[PDB]
Coordinates of C-alpha atoms and ligand atoms in Angstrom, one line a residue:
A24 CA 22.8 -117.8 -144.9
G25 CA 10.4 -91.3 -176.0
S26 CA 13.3 -93.9 -177.1
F27 CA 16.5 -95.0 -174.7
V28 CA 19.0 -92.8 -177.2
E29 CA 15.9 -89.3 -174.8
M30 CA 16.8 -91.3 -171.7
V31 CA 20.8 -90.9 -172.5
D32 CA 22.0 -88.5 -169.7
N33 CA 19.1 -87.9 -168.1
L34 CA 20.9 -88.1 -164.4
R35 CA 22.3 -85.0 -162.2
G36 CA 24.0 -84.1 -159.7
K37 CA 26.4 -82.9 -157.0
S38 CA 29.7 -84.3 -155.3
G39 CA 27.9 -87.3 -152.6
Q40 CA 24.9 -85.9 -153.6
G41 CA 23.4 -89.1 -155.2
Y42 CA 22.4 -88.6 -158.2
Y43 CA 18.5 -88.1 -160.0
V44 CA 15.9 -88.0 -161.9
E45 CA 13.0 -85.5 -163.3
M46 CA 9.6 -87.0 -163.0
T47 CA 6.8 -85.9 -163.0
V48 CA 3.4 -86.7 -160.2
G49 CA -0.9 -85.7 -160.6
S50 CA -2.4 -83.9 -163.3
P51 CA -1.7 -81.1 -163.9
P52 CA 2.3 -82.9 -163.4
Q53 CA 4.3 -81.4 -160.8
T54 CA 7.7 -81.6 -161.9
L55 CA 10.0 -82.7 -159.0
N56 CA 13.8 -84.5 -159.2
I57 CA 13.9 -87.9 -157.9
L58 CA 17.3 -89.1 -156.0
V59 CA 17.5 -92.6 -158.0
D60 CA 17.8 -94.8 -154.9
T61 CA 18.0 -99.0 -155.6
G62 CA 19.3 -99.8 -152.4
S63 CA 15.0 -98.6 -151.2
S64 CA 11.7 -99.6 -152.3
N65 CA 9.9 -96.5 -151.7
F66 CA 8.7 -93.7 -153.8
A67 CA 9.3 -90.8 -151.2
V68 CA 8.3 -87.5 -152.0
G69 CA 8.9 -84.3 -149.7
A70 CA 5.2 -83.0 -149.3
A71 CA 5.5 -80.1 -146.5
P72 CA 7.5 -77.0 -147.6
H73 CA 11.1 -77.9 -145.9
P74 CA 12.8 -74.9 -146.5
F75 CA 15.6 -76.8 -148.0
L76 CA 13.4 -78.1 -150.5
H77 CA 13.6 -76.7 -154.1
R78 CA 9.3 -78.2 -154.4
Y79 CA 7.5 -80.8 -153.2
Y80 CA 4.3 -82.9 -153.4
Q81 CA 1.2 -81.1 -152.9
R82 CA -1.4 -83.5 -152.5
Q83 CA -4.5 -80.9 -152.9
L84 CA -4.1 -79.8 -156.3
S85 CA -3.8 -83.5 -157.8
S86 CA -7.2 -84.7 -159.1
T87 CA -6.4 -87.8 -159.8
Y88 CA -5.0 -88.5 -155.9
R89 CA -6.2 -91.0 -154.7
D90 CA -5.6 -91.5 -150.6
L91 CA -4.7 -94.7 -149.1
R92 CA -5.4 -93.9 -144.7
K93 CA -2.3 -94.8 -143.6
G94 CA 0.8 -93.7 -141.3
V95 CA 4.7 -94.4 -142.1
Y96 CA 7.7 -93.6 -139.9
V97 CA 10.8 -95.3 -141.0
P98 CA 14.0 -95.0 -138.8
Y99 CA 16.8 -95.7 -140.5
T100 CA 21.3 -94.8 -140.3
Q101 CA 22.0 -91.9 -140.3
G102 CA 18.1 -90.3 -139.5
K103 CA 14.3 -90.9 -140.4
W104 CA 11.5 -89.9 -142.4
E105 CA 7.6 -90.0 -141.5
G106 CA 4.6 -90.4 -144.4
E107 CA 1.3 -90.4 -145.7
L108 CA 0.4 -92.8 -147.9
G109 CA -1.6 -92.6 -151.6
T110 CA -1.7 -92.8 -154.8
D111 CA -1.2 -91.1 -158.1
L112 CA 0.0 -90.9 -162.1
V113 CA 3.6 -90.4 -162.1
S114 CA 5.3 -90.5 -165.3
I115 CA 9.1 -90.0 -166.3
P116 CA 9.6 -87.0 -168.7
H117 CA 12.9 -88.2 -170.3
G118 CA 12.1 -92.0 -170.1
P119 CA 9.5 -94.3 -171.1
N120 CA 6.7 -92.7 -172.9
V121 CA 4.2 -94.1 -170.0
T122 CA 1.8 -92.7 -167.1
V123 CA 1.8 -95.3 -164.1
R124 CA -0.6 -95.3 -161.0
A125 CA 1.5 -95.5 -158.8
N126 CA 2.5 -95.8 -153.6
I127 CA 3.2 -92.3 -152.8
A128 CA 5.1 -92.0 -149.6
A129 CA 4.3 -88.0 -149.4
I130 CA 7.1 -87.1 -146.5
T131 CA 5.7 -84.3 -143.5
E132 CA 8.7 -85.0 -140.5
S133 CA 11.9 -85.9 -140.7
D134 CA 15.4 -86.2 -140.0
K135 CA 18.8 -86.3 -141.4
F136 CA 16.8 -87.0 -144.7
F137 CA 17.3 -83.8 -147.3
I138 CA 20.3 -82.2 -147.7
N139 CA 21.2 -79.1 -147.4
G140 CA 21.9 -77.6 -151.1
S141 CA 21.3 -80.6 -153.1
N142 CA 19.0 -80.0 -156.3
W143 CA 16.5 -83.2 -155.4
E144 CA 13.1 -83.5 -152.8
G145 CA 12.0 -87.0 -152.8
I146 CA 13.7 -91.1 -153.1
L147 CA 13.2 -93.3 -156.0
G148 CA 13.6 -97.0 -154.3
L149 CA 14.2 -99.0 -157.7
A150 CA 14.9 -102.9 -154.6
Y151 CA 12.5 -105.3 -154.5
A152 CA 8.9 -105.2 -152.9
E153 CA 10.5 -107.6 -149.2
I154 CA 12.5 -103.9 -148.3
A155 CA 8.7 -101.9 -148.6
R156 CA 7.9 -99.9 -146.0
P157 CA 5.6 -100.8 -144.0
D158 CA 5.3 -104.2 -145.7
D159 CA 5.7 -106.2 -149.0
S160 CA 2.3 -106.1 -149.9
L161 CA 3.0 -102.1 -150.3
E162 CA 4.2 -102.2 -154.7
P163 CA 7.0 -100.7 -156.0
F164 CA 6.9 -98.2 -158.2
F165 CA 8.4 -100.1 -161.3
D166 CA 6.4 -103.1 -159.9
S167 CA 3.9 -100.9 -161.1
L168 CA 5.5 -99.7 -164.3
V169 CA 6.8 -103.2 -165.4
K170 CA 2.8 -104.4 -164.4
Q171 CA 0.8 -101.3 -166.3
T172 CA 2.6 -100.9 -169.3
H173 CA 4.5 -102.8 -171.6
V174 CA 8.2 -101.4 -170.5
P175 CA 10.4 -104.6 -170.7
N176 CA 11.2 -105.8 -167.2
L177 CA 14.8 -104.2 -166.4
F178 CA 16.7 -101.2 -165.7
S179 CA 20.1 -99.5 -166.2
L180 CA 22.1 -97.4 -165.0
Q181 CA 25.5 -95.7 -166.3
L182 CA 27.3 -93.0 -163.4
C183 CA 29.5 -91.0 -164.4
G184 CA 30.4 -88.7 -161.5
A185 CA 32.7 -86.5 -163.0
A186 CA 31.0 -80.9 -159.4
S187 CA 28.0 -81.5 -161.2
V188 CA 27.8 -85.4 -161.8
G189 CA 25.4 -87.0 -164.5
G190 CA 24.3 -90.3 -166.2
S191 CA 21.1 -92.2 -167.6
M192 CA 19.3 -94.0 -166.5
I193 CA 18.6 -96.8 -169.5
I194 CA 14.6 -97.4 -168.2
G195 CA 13.0 -100.9 -170.3
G196 CA 16.0 -102.1 -171.8
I197 CA 20.4 -101.2 -172.3
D198 CA 21.8 -98.7 -174.6
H199 CA 25.4 -100.0 -176.1
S200 CA 26.5 -96.6 -176.7
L201 CA 27.4 -96.5 -173.1
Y202 CA 29.5 -99.5 -172.9
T203 CA 32.9 -100.9 -173.6
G204 CA 33.6 -105.1 -174.2
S205 CA 30.8 -106.9 -172.6
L206 CA 28.9 -107.6 -170.1
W207 CA 29.1 -109.9 -167.6
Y208 CA 26.0 -111.1 -165.5
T209 CA 26.1 -112.3 -161.9
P210 CA 23.1 -113.8 -160.6
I211 CA 20.5 -111.4 -157.9
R212 CA 20.8 -114.0 -154.9
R213 CA 17.4 -112.7 -153.8
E214 CA 15.0 -110.3 -154.4
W215 CA 14.8 -108.2 -152.0
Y216 CA 18.1 -105.3 -152.6
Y217 CA 19.4 -106.4 -155.4
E218 CA 22.2 -108.8 -153.8
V219 CA 25.2 -110.2 -155.1
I220 CA 27.9 -112.3 -154.3
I221 CA 31.3 -111.7 -153.8
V222 CA 34.1 -115.3 -154.4
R223 CA 37.5 -112.9 -153.8
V224 CA 38.8 -109.4 -153.9
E225 CA 42.5 -108.8 -155.1
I226 CA 44.4 -105.5 -154.3
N227 CA 46.3 -105.4 -157.2
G228 CA 45.7 -108.7 -158.6
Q229 CA 46.8 -110.0 -154.7
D230 CA 44.2 -112.0 -153.5
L231 CA 42.8 -111.2 -150.1
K232 CA 43.1 -115.4 -149.5
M233 CA 40.0 -114.7 -147.5
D234 CA 36.8 -117.3 -146.8
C235 CA 34.9 -115.8 -149.3
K236 CA 32.2 -116.2 -146.5
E237 CA 34.3 -113.0 -144.4
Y238 CA 32.6 -110.6 -148.3
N239 CA 29.2 -111.7 -148.0
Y240 CA 28.8 -111.6 -144.7
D241 CA 26.0 -111.1 -143.7
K242 CA 24.7 -110.0 -148.0
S243 CA 26.2 -108.5 -150.5
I244 CA 24.0 -105.4 -152.5
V245 CA 24.7 -103.0 -155.8
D246 CA 23.4 -100.1 -154.5
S247 CA 23.2 -96.6 -156.4
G248 CA 21.6 -94.8 -152.8
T249 CA 25.4 -95.3 -151.1
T250 CA 28.5 -93.5 -152.0
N251 CA 31.8 -95.1 -150.8
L252 CA 32.9 -99.2 -151.4
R253 CA 31.6 -100.4 -148.1
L254 CA 32.7 -103.5 -147.2
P255 CA 32.1 -105.6 -143.8
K256 CA 35.1 -104.9 -140.9
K257 CA 37.1 -108.2 -140.9
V258 CA 37.6 -107.0 -144.5
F259 CA 37.5 -104.0 -144.5
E260 CA 40.8 -104.5 -142.7
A261 CA 42.8 -106.9 -144.8
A262 CA 41.7 -104.7 -147.0
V263 CA 43.5 -101.6 -146.7
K264 CA 46.3 -103.6 -145.1
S265 CA 47.2 -104.5 -148.3
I266 CA 46.8 -101.2 -149.9
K267 CA 48.5 -99.7 -148.0
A268 CA 51.7 -101.9 -148.4
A269 CA 50.9 -101.6 -152.7
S270 CA 51.4 -97.6 -152.1
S271 CA 53.5 -98.6 -149.3
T272 CA 56.1 -95.5 -151.2
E273 CA 54.1 -92.5 -149.0
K274 CA 53.2 -93.0 -145.7
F275 CA 49.7 -91.4 -145.2
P276 CA 48.0 -90.8 -141.3
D277 CA 45.9 -94.0 -139.0
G278 CA 42.8 -91.6 -139.6
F279 CA 42.8 -91.7 -143.5
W280 CA 42.2 -94.7 -143.5
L281 CA 39.7 -94.5 -141.3
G282 CA 37.7 -91.7 -143.4
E283 CA 38.8 -89.4 -140.5
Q284 CA 41.2 -87.2 -142.3
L285 CA 41.6 -85.9 -145.7
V286 CA 44.9 -86.3 -147.8
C287 CA 45.9 -83.2 -149.4
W288 CA 48.7 -82.7 -153.0
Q289 CA 49.9 -80.3 -155.0
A290 CA 47.4 -78.2 -157.3
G291 CA 48.0 -80.9 -159.9
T292 CA 49.4 -83.8 -158.3
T293 CA 47.7 -86.8 -156.9
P294 CA 50.3 -89.9 -157.4
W295 CA 47.7 -91.9 -159.3
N296 CA 50.1 -94.5 -160.1
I297 CA 51.2 -95.5 -156.8
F298 CA 47.6 -96.3 -155.7
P299 CA 46.2 -100.3 -156.9
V300 CA 44.0 -101.3 -158.7
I301 CA 40.9 -102.9 -156.2
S302 CA 39.5 -106.5 -158.3
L303 CA 36.7 -108.0 -156.5
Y304 CA 35.5 -111.6 -158.3
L305 CA 31.2 -111.9 -159.0
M306 CA 29.7 -115.8 -159.4
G307 CA 29.4 -116.1 -162.5
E308 CA 25.9 -117.1 -164.8
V309 CA 27.7 -120.9 -164.8
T310 CA 28.5 -123.7 -162.2
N311 CA 32.1 -123.0 -161.3
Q312 CA 32.0 -119.8 -163.2
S313 CA 33.3 -116.1 -162.6
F314 CA 33.9 -113.1 -163.2
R315 CA 35.5 -109.7 -162.7
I316 CA 34.8 -106.3 -161.8
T317 CA 38.4 -103.8 -161.6
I318 CA 38.4 -99.8 -160.1
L319 CA 41.0 -97.4 -160.2
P320 CA 42.3 -95.1 -157.2
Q321 CA 40.4 -92.3 -159.7
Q322 CA 37.1 -94.0 -158.1
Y323 CA 38.2 -94.9 -154.9
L324 CA 39.6 -91.6 -153.8
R325 CA 37.5 -89.1 -153.8
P326 CA 37.9 -85.3 -154.5
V327 CA 36.9 -83.0 -151.8
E328 CA 35.8 -79.3 -153.1
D329 CA 34.2 -77.8 -150.5
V330 CA 37.7 -77.2 -148.3
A331 CA 38.7 -74.1 -148.0
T332 CA 41.4 -75.1 -144.8
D333 CA 46.2 -78.2 -152.5
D334 CA 43.9 -81.0 -154.0
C335 CA 42.3 -82.7 -150.9
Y336 CA 41.3 -86.0 -151.5
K337 CA 38.5 -88.3 -149.2
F338 CA 39.7 -92.7 -149.1
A339 CA 36.1 -93.0 -149.7
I340 CA 36.8 -97.3 -148.5
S341 CA 34.6 -98.1 -145.5
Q342 CA 33.8 -101.1 -142.4
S343 CA 30.1 -101.3 -142.3
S344 CA 27.9 -104.4 -140.0
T345 CA 25.5 -104.1 -143.1
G346 CA 28.0 -106.3 -145.6
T347 CA 29.3 -105.4 -148.6
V348 CA 27.9 -102.3 -150.4
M349 CA 28.5 -101.5 -154.2
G350 CA 27.7 -98.2 -154.4
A351 CA 29.3 -95.2 -156.6
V352 CA 33.0 -96.0 -155.7
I353 CA 31.4 -99.5 -157.2
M354 CA 28.9 -98.4 -160.0
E355 CA 30.9 -94.8 -161.1
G356 CA 33.7 -97.8 -163.2
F357 CA 30.4 -99.2 -164.6
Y358 CA 27.8 -99.5 -167.4
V359 CA 25.4 -101.0 -164.2
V360 CA 21.9 -103.1 -166.0
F361 CA 19.9 -104.3 -163.5
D362 CA 17.9 -107.4 -165.3
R363 CA 15.2 -108.4 -163.7
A364 CA 14.0 -110.0 -165.7
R365 CA 16.0 -112.8 -165.5
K366 CA 17.0 -112.3 -161.5
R367 CA 20.8 -111.2 -163.0
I368 CA 23.3 -107.9 -162.5
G369 CA 25.3 -106.9 -166.1
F370 CA 28.6 -105.3 -165.8
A371 CA 30.1 -103.7 -168.9
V372 CA 33.8 -101.1 -168.6
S373 CA 31.5 -97.7 -168.5
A374 CA 32.1 -95.4 -172.3
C375 CA 32.2 -92.5 -169.2
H376 CA 34.5 -93.8 -166.6
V377 CA 37.1 -91.5 -164.7
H378 CA 40.7 -93.1 -165.5
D379 CA 43.8 -92.2 -167.3
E380 CA 47.0 -93.1 -169.7
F381 CA 48.5 -96.5 -167.5
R382 CA 45.5 -98.3 -166.1
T383 CA 41.7 -98.6 -167.0
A384 CA 38.5 -99.6 -165.6
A385 CA 37.8 -103.6 -166.0
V386 CA 35.3 -106.4 -166.5
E387 CA 37.4 -109.1 -167.6
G388 CA 36.9 -113.6 -168.5
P389 CA 35.4 -116.5 -167.6
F390 CA 37.3 -117.5 -164.7
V391 CA 37.1 -120.5 -162.7
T392 CA 36.5 -120.4 -159.0
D393 CA 35.5 -123.3 -157.4
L394 CA 32.6 -123.7 -153.8
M395 CA 30.7 -120.8 -155.0
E396 CA 27.8 -121.2 -153.4
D397 CA 29.3 -121.6 -150.0
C398 CA 30.4 -117.9 -149.7
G399 CA 26.5 -117.0 -149.3
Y400 CA 25.5 -116.0 -146.3
Ligands
LIG1 C1 12.6 -96.3 -147.7 O1 13.5 -95.6 -147.1 C2 14.8 -95.6 -146.9 C3 14.5 -95.0 -148.6 C4 16.3 -94.5 -148.7 C5 18.0 -94.4 -147.1 C6 17.1 -92.8 -146.6 C7 18.4 -92.0 -147.7 C8 18.4 -90.8 -147.8 C9 19.3 -90.1 -148.0 C10 20.2 -90.7 -149.0 C11 21.2 -90.4 -150.3 C12 22.3 -89.1 -149.7 N1 22.9 -88.7 -149.6 C13 23.4 -89.2 -151.5 N2 22.7 -90.7 -152.0 C14 22.1 -91.1 -151.1 C15 19.9 -92.6 -149.5 C16 19.2 -93.1 -148.5 C17 18.8 -94.7 -148.1 C18 19.9 -95.2 -146.9 O2 21.0 -95.8 -147.6 C19 19.7 -96.1 -148.5 N3 20.5 -96.4 -150.2 N4 19.5 -95.8 -149.5 C20 17.5 -96.4 -146.3 C21 16.0 -95.6 -146.4 C22 15.5 -96.7 -145.4

């Protein structure tokens, strides 16, 4: 600077293509698969017959559709989308037994937005109004949901990974069968993205010893719509140097660490044990108190099953000029509670995370960490 035990297993997807939930829009209801995205704030759905789409929102068939007479052009890093703003009745079949009138951006043109071969047709932006397009007056879906119903102002995500991937989005609550041990909370620094503060970073218990502002330059966010653990350039360089040193029993090309090439091992091998564990200490709920979340190589070394030329992997930790992004590689190790009502995010060891006989993902605390307020950019 529609009970919780009907919401378990309501998410699906394919490797690297994100997680989606089934939703219905309009009257009579039109079924659509929608990407769950904690890194954005618009409910944007394909509304034209793009050849890649299995289905799309047909506004002419909805008696409850209302036109907002406003368009939006949304450029981003990787592509763009253009939409026509409107409102309609929205429901989540494997969610709460409610129907809400929400803002919907009917996508009429796009570039590198929809994925060739994916099974989703829209995006559910679960973040705050501050980052909604075109401005903060366009109420996000979750804000409409809580304002129009008795649904508690909270949601939780268990992203399991694996190929078909699966998980759970518990809307309005927490399902205690989705995690082991205790939930540990980090404050939401500002209600725009789900912004958090990282106070310390360790590779196999070894501190990176950097000025903690570097870990949050210019922000640190929790984003279900991003695959990688993205780190600020300076942090990435120190983390890679430490990971290289920890795994020095086997040498890999420079391109592997930069995500420019895959590394392959025999059909049943993979030396998980040579790769270090990665710990992120998050600001706690109390003055000078923190906790740490720990991920395994099973989270940050992603298998690539698309290879047509051996078991090949992609290093899923990458450099970022937009700050730290705690994507799927972080989230797949944990049960994540987006406690909007208390402006905090809870982490707990996921009951579905991929691990081995020697190591497990961990959420531990409390730790004493001084000057935590100084870590925020
Ligand atoms: C309001 O407009 C938002 C809409 C949302 C994206 C666009 C997008 C498309 C696909 C996926 C995508 C692909 N594969 C897998 N997962 C997600 C992600 C995004 C974004 C970028 O980053 C995050 N968080 N969301 C950013 C954009 C500014």
